[PDB]
């Protein structure tokens, strides 16, 4: 595994998130389920817990963007960059942005929102990219298996090195 400077990790175990906007590719319920599942990957193996807020300020602000979306890191249309995120901290810190010029799905087609979100949330929590193509924190997307997602050991070990099991 690989972690960003360990000193700057989330000092509190209860974190909040908010879905700022929704891709029209899936229903609100489907988007919500994808993100809920994505956070659970991490909370299942650490003391972190996540609560979704319907409004107001949250630690992890999630949004869908097309090209220039407000920050210095514009998306690039279909394919290429799929999403990005920011390490723990104020404002942008912890936030995740998904490129809506992708087709987001709950399947093997287009790009699976849950899988990409699980990776990005890894950054939101302090993990860097892994050099192992088999790890979730590997930056190039590969559609995983057939049905049953299992957080690879390396990613478990990384996040626990930060927050404990």
């Amino acid at each position: 595994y690989n972690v960003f400077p360990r000193t700057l990790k989330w000092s509190k175990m209860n974190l909040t998130y908010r879905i700022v906007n929704y891709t029209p590719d899936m229903t609100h319920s489907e988007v919500e389920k994808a993100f809920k599942k994505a956070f659970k990957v991490w909370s299942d193996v650490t003391p972190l817990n996540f609560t979704r807020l319907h409004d107001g300020i949250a630690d992890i602000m999630i949004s869908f963007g097309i090209k220039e979306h407000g920050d210095f890191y514009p998306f690039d249309g279909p394919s290429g960059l799929l999403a990005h995120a920011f390490p723990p901290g104020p404002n942008y810190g912890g936030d995740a942005h998904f490129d809506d010029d992708e087709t987001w799905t709950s399947s093997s087609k287009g790009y699976n929102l849950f899988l990409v979100a699980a990776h990005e949330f890894g950054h939101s929590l302090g993990l860097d990219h892994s050099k192992d193509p088999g790890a979730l924190m590997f930056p190039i997307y590969t559609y995983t298996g057939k049905s049953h997602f299992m957080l690879p050991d390396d990613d478990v070990q990384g996040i626990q090195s930060l927050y404990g099991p």
Partner: protein, 180 residues
């Protein structure tokens, strides 16, 4: 940062610039402040262009990338003995911008077919689409496509097709994988 898997031909065809180069220095450059007041920096790599396979005639002397991996920042070896195959975006004359989603690999990791394909074979294939096969069964929907089967056949983006094949238009048929 999450990136689409890409076969080298796609990378060649989609990038503004494709070069063989060596990075010799790294420097942080001030690029303003974000909406919250955080200073924005870019990393500036001073490079030596060894050869350009595609791009503007003005040689690339600088490559910019984000400081953070998490917004797709790239780290290059600045020792000066490590060569890279860099595909990326063209900025002002002599400047280039790269992200992790770009195709960037150590020159020495390239198959002989991949190195040679940079001169002309990949360009020959640009009119063909290379399509992903995330999970079987994936079909050949159209004649102008090749199906990239590396992921589902073997477990590597740089599989058999990436290393040895290009997707090029045939006479009678349209596109098909070719090893030449």
């Amino acid at each position: 940062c999450s990136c689409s898997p890409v076969h080298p031909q796609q990378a060649f065809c989609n990038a503004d610039i494709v070069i063989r180069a060596k990075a010799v220095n790294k420097k942080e450059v001030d690029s303003g402040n974000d909406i919250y007041g955080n200073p924005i920096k870019r990393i500036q790599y001073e490079i030596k262009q060894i050869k350009m396979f595609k791009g503007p005639d003005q040689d690339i002397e600088f490559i910019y990338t984000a400081p953070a991996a998490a917004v797709c920042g790239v780290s290059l070896d600045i020792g000066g003995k490590k060569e890279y195959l860099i595909a990326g975006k063209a900025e002002g004359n002599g400047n280039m911008h790269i992200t992790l989603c770009d195709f960037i690999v150590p020159w020495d990791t390239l198959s002989a077919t991949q190195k040679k394909s940079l001169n002309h074979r990949y360009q020959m294939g640009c009119e063909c689409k290379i399509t992903r096969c995330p999970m079987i069964p994936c079909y050949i929907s159209s004649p102008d496509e090749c199906l990239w089967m590396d992921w589902v056949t073997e477990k590597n983006i740089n599989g058999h097709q990436a290393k040895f094949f290009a997707c090029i238009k045939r006479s009678d048929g349209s596109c098909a994988w070719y090893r030449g």
